[PDB]
Amino acid sequence: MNIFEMLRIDEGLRLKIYKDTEGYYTIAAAHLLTKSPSLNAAKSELDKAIGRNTNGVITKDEAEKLFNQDVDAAVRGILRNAKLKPVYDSLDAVRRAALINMVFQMGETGVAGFTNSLRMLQQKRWDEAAVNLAKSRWYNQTPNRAKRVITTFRTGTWDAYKNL
C-alpha cells in the first residue's frame, strides 16, 4: 500500500470519459476535462493531453500518466502552501498519504481552510482531529471515503484500506 494504491481505491481509474457528480466530463482518476455539456469539447481536451485521436478511450499507461501527474500536483500544492507544508513536514509517511489524498480531492485551498483540524494534526492529536473532521461538510458529502481518510489520520496505519 502507498499513496497510489490508496487513491486508486478512493477515486478509481476510468479509461473512458465519464460524468462527474455535477455532470462534468472526466477521466482517469477524477481528471476534469471540460465543464461544458459538449462531449466534443471533452474529447478535444483529452487529445491535446494525450497527443493522439483518443476518441474518448485511453490506454492504462496513458491513464496512469495523467494520474501520476495529478498526484505530483497535489504534492506540489502542499509544499508551496504556508499552512500545509509545516503539517506535512511533521507527519509520518502514512499520514502524509492521507493529507495528499485530501488535497487531491479538494485542492490545496480547500484543505488549507481546515485550520483547526490542521493545527490538531500538527500537535499529534489524532483522536481530536478525527472527531473534528467527522463533523465537516466534506465528511457529509463523501462519508465512506472521508471515514477511510480520517481513520488513517487517526491510526497511522492502512487498516481502512486493507479491510474492504
From Swiss-Prot:
Keyword set includes Hydrolase: yes
EC number(s) stated in the UniProt entry for this protein: 3.2.1.17
SUPFAM superfamilies in the cross-refs: Lysozyme-like
Mutagenesis / variant outcome for changing residue 117 to I: 500-fold decrease in enzymatic activity
InterPro entries in UniProt: Endolysin_T4_type, Glyco_hydro_24, Lysozyme-like_dom_sf, Lysozyme_dom_sf, Phage_lysozyme-like, T4-type_lysozyme
Induction pattern: Expressed late in the viral replication.
Function as written in the Swiss-Prot or TrEMBL entry: Endolysin with lysozyme activity that degrades host peptidoglycans and participates with the holin and spanin proteins in the sequential events which lead to the programmed host cell lysis releasing the mature viral particles. Once the holin has permeabilized the host cell membrane, the endolysin can reach the periplasm and break down the peptidoglycan layer.
Subcellular location: Host cytoplasm
Outcome of mutating residue 117 to V: 50-fold decrease in enzymatic activity
Presence of the UniProt keyword Hydrolase in the record: yes
Activity-pH dependence: Optimum pH is 7.3.
Active site: 11 (proton donor/acceptor), 20 (proton donor/acceptor)
Effect of residue 20 to E/Q: Loss of 99% of enzymatic activity
Location, primary (coarse class): host cell
Enzyme class, UniProt record, top EC level: hydrolase
Leader sequence segment: none
Record annotation: effect of changing residue 26 to H: Facilitates transglycosylation more effectively than hydrolysis; covalently bound substrate
GO molecular function: lysozyme activity
Family: Belongs to the glycosyl hydrolase 24 family.
One Pfam entry name: Phage_lysozyme
GO biological process, one term: peptidoglycan catabolic process
Catalyzed reactions: Hydrolysis of (1->4)-beta-linkages between N-acetylmuramic acid and N-acetyl-D-glucosamine residues in a peptidoglycan and between N-acetyl-D-glucosamine residues in chitodextrins
Protein name: Endolysin
